[PDB]
Paper text:
Crystal structures of THAS (here referred to as THAS1), a second representative THAS (Cr_021691, THAS2) and the structure of the promiscuous homologue (Cr_032583b, HYS) were solved and mutants revealed key residues that control the stereochemistry of the product profiles. The HYSs perform a single, chemically straightforward reduction reaction that immediately neutralizes the reactivity of strictosidine aglycone/cathenamine. The biological unit is an elongated homodimer, with each subunit divided into a substrate and cofactor-binding domain; the latter also being responsible for forming the dimer interface. The active site cavities of the HYSs are framed by helix α2, the catalytic zinc coordination sphere, and loops 1 and 2, with the NADP(H) co-substrate binding at the base of the active site.
Numbering used by the authors:
A (entry chain A): 4 to 357
B (entry chain B): 10 to 359
Write the structure that this text describes.
Amino acid sequence: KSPENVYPVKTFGFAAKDSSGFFSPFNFSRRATGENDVQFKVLYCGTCNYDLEMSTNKFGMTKYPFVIGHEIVGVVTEIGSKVQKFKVGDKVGVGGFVGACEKCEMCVNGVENNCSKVESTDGHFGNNFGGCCNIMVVNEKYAVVWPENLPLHSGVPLLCAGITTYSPLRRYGLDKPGLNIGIAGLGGLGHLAIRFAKAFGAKVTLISSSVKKKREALEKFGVDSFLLNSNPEEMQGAYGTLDGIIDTMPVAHSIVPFLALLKPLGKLIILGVPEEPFEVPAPALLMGGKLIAGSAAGSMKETQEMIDFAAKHNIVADVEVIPIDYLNTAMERIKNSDVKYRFVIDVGNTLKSP
Amino acid sequence: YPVKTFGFAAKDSSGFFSPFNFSRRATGENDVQFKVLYCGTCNYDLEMSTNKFGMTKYPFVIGHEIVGVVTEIGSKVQKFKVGDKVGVGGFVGACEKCEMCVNGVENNCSKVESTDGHFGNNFGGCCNIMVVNEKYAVVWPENLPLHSGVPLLCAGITTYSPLRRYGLDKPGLNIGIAGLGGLGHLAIRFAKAFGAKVTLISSSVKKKREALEKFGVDSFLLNSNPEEMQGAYGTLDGIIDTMPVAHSIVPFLALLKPLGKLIILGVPEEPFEVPAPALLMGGKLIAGSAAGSMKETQEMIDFAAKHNIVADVEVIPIDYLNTAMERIKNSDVKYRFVIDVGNTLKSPSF
Ligand SMILES: [Zn+2]
Ligand SMILES: [Zn+2]
Ligand SMILES: [Zn+2]
Ligand SMILES: [Zn+2]
C-alpha cells in the first residue's frame, strides 16, 4: 500500500495531505530507470498559482497525497540503455506532462499536450508525484535538453509561464520582426511575453490598469509604448494599430477595447482566467475579422524549441529563490501576487533527507 | 455621368422601393459594362434601406450581388470579351496602395468602396446597366446558373472564406454548422464538397429533418438538449455559426476538439458571454468573418461551378421587391430572393 514501498527508487519531498494545502515532508518511491528513462537529481522546482489551486483542491478533483512540481530542472544521474539525448551530468527539464497515449491524432501530430490521455507530471490527470522531491525519472521523450548557457534557477519557470506565452506567439504568427505586439498585464506571464516579443523583434506595447507599471515597463523591459486601459483618449489613439495582444490579466476586465486596438486580421490571445466571463459583441469580432484565442501550456516540440530560443537570446524569468521549508509561506504570497514574479524552490540545497 | 441608366431605389427610411433614374460613367480602359440579368438581395438590404444603423445615403439603390452579360469593354481589359457573363460582389474599389490591399485582402481596407454606396458615393446593381473596374468583376463559368448562383457573391463567399482561412476545407474533418438559413445552407454545401463529415446544430427539431433529407447531413445536435450536446463534446474541428439570435457559444466551444475553431457569421444584439476556461481548456479560438477578397471570390465561384453548388432561391419580379423586404424581416424565404431584372425591370415611360 504505502507509497515508499511501491517502487524500488526511494524518494522524498513535500506533499499536501488534504485540502488545507499544507505541504509537509513526504516519503514515496519512483520506478527504476528503464531503458528509455532519464533519472535526475532535482535542483530547482518552480511553482505558481496552479499549485495553490490544486493543493487547496479548488476544483474538487485533487488526489491526496499531492506532490507539486510541473516545472523542474536538475542534473542527470542515470540514463537507460537506449537513451540518445542525455548523458550522466547533463542538465534536464521537465514540464507539465510526462506521458500521453502516443497513438491518437494529437500525439501523432506532435501536439500531445492535447491528448485526452495526457499524463500530468504532478498527477492531477493520472497517478504520479510531481518533481518537488530529491529524485525524478521521466521517459526521454518528455525530457527537455537543457543547455549550459540557460541558468537553471531563473530558467525553470520557462517550462510553465514561458511556454504559455511562447506557444501562441509562434502559432498565431506574432513572432515576426517589426510587428506591433501588445501585452496586457505585467506579471508572471506578461514579463516573459515581453522578453520573447522583444527577442522576436516586435514593437511592444504594455497595456495596464496601473500607471506605476509604466516606468517599470520602460526602464526594465525596454517597452516602446504604454497604454493605460482606464484612459479612453490614450486607448482610442492606438485603435487599429496592434497585430496582436497577449492578455495576461487575471482580474475582471473588458476585451472590447483590446479588440478595437487590433488591426484587421489581428489576434487577441487570452492567458489569464478571470472569474468574470468576457462579454464579446459579435460586431467587435466581425469588424476586421479578428480572433480571440485561449492558450495554455504547449507541446514537447514547442517546449524544446522555446528553451533553445531562450538560451540563445539570454531570456530568463524574474524569480525569488526560496528554501523548501518556505513553501507554505510562498503559497500565501502567491494568493496575494506578492512575488516578483515567480517562486523557485532550491531543492538541491535545501531539501534534506528525513 | 453620360451612361443613361434606371433602376429601383429607396427615398427615405420607410425602405419603400420605386423606379429611380440615374447614370454611370462611360467605360474607362480598365472597365466592364454589362446588362444586369439577376440581382440578389438579403437582410443587409432590408437593414440599409430602413436605416437601421443611421448612416444610409439616400436615394439608395440596392444591389451588391449581381450578374449579367458584357455589353462593352475598355482598351486594356484582359479578363472579358463582349457577350460573356460576369458578376459583381459587395465592393467595386479600394485604396490599392495599403497593407490589406497589397496582400490581397482589400475587403479589410478602411477606404473600401461598397457597390451599393454606403462606404462611398455609389449606386448598386438593381438597375438595367452596370459598369465596374475589371479587377472587381468575377469571370462567370458557363455551367454555373446565374439565377441560383448570384447569391454566392454574398452568402457564398461569407461561408467559403473562413472555411479556407481556418483550414476547415480538408477531407475527413468534423465541421459543425449552427443554423440552417441562408448562410447555413451554403456552408453545408461547401463543407460537403471539401469532404467533411457535417453536423447541423440547431434550436429547431424541424431543421433536423430538413438537414438529413435535403442536405445529406450526418449528425444533428439540438442545442436546447444538454444530454445530446454532452455526447458530442470534443468531436468537431470547426464550427461555422450562422445563428442571428441571442445564444450561448459556451456549448459550441465545448463541441470543439483541442485547437478547434468557432467562426461567428451571425450578428446577435446580445453579446456572447465567454468564460476564459471555455477558450483555455483546449486552446480554442473564436473568430469573426464577413465577406472576403476578390481572389477568394473568383476561386469560390470556380469551386462552386466545379462541384455543382448553387443557392436555393426564390426568383421574383421587381414589383415584388417591397413584399420581399417584409419576408426577409420574417425569415420566410428559401433561402435568398433573386430579382429577375432582365425580364421584369421595365424602362420608364416618356
Ligand atoms: Zn507553474
Ligand atoms: Zn494521444
Ligand atoms: Zn447580400
Ligand atoms: Zn487599401
